[PDB]
């Protein structure tokens, strides 16, 4: 092809088992380091010095409870580089200080960039429109808002999600108790996009499978399809009539249908991201002021919204002392909010 | 517990509230109540909605 | 005589979809604006 650049390009784009491309020089090492960082930490690394927690198989945790936990609040938003001023090239200390957290978060962030470049690069070579890459911006906006923006607005990385199954659950419950995140209309659009996406997935796959044409003799119908065949493998006409009579409306345009399948969950995840940007600043949708004024003045006024705030105040009081150890919270028994008996 | 828009709720706080714990799993149709007043107090609409909805 | 001009279109379905988006947004966000 000519010069070294073009020769390298040739090599990068070879049609092999795992495509590489230029995006691969970014993608592969960052994806591999993020993942091996996760497996290494969850397998061998403690969270004792950062959280007062065990978090590895080595310490006795199981798959649901291991994590690579965030650094201590005293670390602020430090990059926590191995060779930074905190660890000073000491690998053991680095592990003990939360270095694997930023390691996994930043490599994962560059890996995600790499994956989306890989989607643009492959689509360009195959000659397709890059809608898949565009759809992937939703996972990006979620990762960036939640793993980067959020803790950057807060006091330190300590308040980011820790990479673990149970750690993520804790993150959920913290958002309920502290931010009342379920009330937030950007989270609600997120839910609509995720549940609507899942509905669209189930309903489209089931509709195709139940308006298939008989193009074979087999009672198993999978073999009666040919990737290169000109014709639709199912009847849009029958599908349309079925939904029209069942539900009252139906798709008629297959291009619309598919575009809509891209649109709904992508838009959903984007909306949740915007709300999480809000929560980085404690800019919550926490309260309805008119309910508070009525409830303050009328002790017989009660709604599900008042009931859930009592739950939140329970969550804050009861989880904070162990969840935020650097605050040294001591809450004597008499101050803890509790209802009767419990 | 106030569920309805006219009794101080918005779309987000509003609800049709579950029937009374004093009822338990007892069947509480409108004719089991002394009055609609009582029926409403005890959350009769919830049972009516969810039973017709589930069958439907 | 600007040759770049072109008409906007909006089919019926798109009208309905747009009205649904708007109405539904209004319904979802109105509580937060009354506060």
């Amino acid at each position: 092809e000519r010069g070294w650049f073009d020769i390298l390009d040739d090599w990068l784009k070879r049609d092999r088992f795992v495509f590489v491309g230029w995006s691969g020089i970014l993608l592969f090492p960052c994806a591999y380091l993020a993942l091996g960082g996760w497996l290494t930490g969850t397998t061998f690394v403690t969270s004792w010095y950062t959280h007062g927690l065990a978090s590895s198989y080595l310490e006795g945790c199981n798959f649901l409870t291991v994590a690579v936990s965030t650094p201590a609040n005293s670390m602020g938003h430090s990059l926590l580089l191995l060779w930074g001023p905190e660890a000073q090239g000491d690998f053991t200390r680095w592990c003990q200080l939360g270095g694997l957290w930023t390691f996994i978060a930043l490599h994962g962030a560059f890996g995600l960039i790499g994956f989306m470049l890989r989607q643009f690069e492959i689509a360009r070579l195959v000659g397709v429109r890059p809608y898949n890459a565009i759809a992937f911006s939703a996972p990006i906006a979620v990762f960036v808002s939640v793993f980067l923006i959020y803790p950057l607005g807060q006091s330190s990385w300590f308040f980011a999600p820790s990479f673990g199954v149970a750690a993520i659950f804790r993150f959920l419950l913290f958002f309920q108790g502290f931010h009342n995140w379920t009330l937030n209309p950007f989270h609600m659009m997120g839910v609509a996009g995720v549940l609507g996406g899942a509905l669209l997935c189930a309903i489209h796959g089931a509709t195709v499978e139940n308006t298939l044409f008989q193009d074979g003799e087999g009672a198993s119908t999978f073999r009666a399809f040919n990737p290169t065949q000109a014709e639709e493998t199912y009847s849009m006409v029958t599908a349309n009539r079925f939904w029209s009579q069942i539900f009252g409306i139906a798709f008629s345009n297959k291009r619309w249908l598919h575009f809509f399948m891209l649109f709904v969950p992508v838009t959903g995840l984007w909306m949740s991201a915007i709300g999480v940007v809000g929560l980085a600043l404690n800019l919550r949708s926490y309260d309805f002021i008119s309910q508070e004024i009525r409830a303050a003045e009328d002790p017989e006024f009660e709604t599900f919204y008042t009931k859930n705030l009592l739950l939140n105040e329970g969550i804050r009081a009861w989880m904070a002392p162990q969840d935020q150890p650097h605050e040294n919270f001591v809450f004597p028994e008499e101050v803890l909010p509790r209802g009767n008996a419990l | 517990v106030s569920g309805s828009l006219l009794y101080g709720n918005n779309i987000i706080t509003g609800a049709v509230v579950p029937s009374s714990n004093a009822i338990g799993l007892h069947f509480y149709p409108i004719w089991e109540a002394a009055s609609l007043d009582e029926w409403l107090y005890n959350g009769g609409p919830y049972q009516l909605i969810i039973f017709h909805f589930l069958l439907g | 005589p600007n040759p770049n001009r072109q008409p906007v279109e909006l089919n019926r379905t798109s009208l309905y979809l747009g009205l649904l988006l708007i109405l539904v947004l209004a319904l979802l966000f109105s509580s937060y604006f009354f506060n």
Partner: peptide, 30 residues
């Protein structure tokens, strides 16, 4: 005014449902 607004938006959606169904663009097999 607040209840009215909620019920009004809701009623507009229900009407929009009825037109979307019964006065849809008919699907044409051509």
């Amino acid at each position: 005014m607040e209840t009215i607004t909620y019920v009004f938006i809701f009623a507009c959606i229900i009407a929009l449902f009825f037109f979307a169904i019964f006065f849809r663009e008919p699907p044409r097999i051509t």
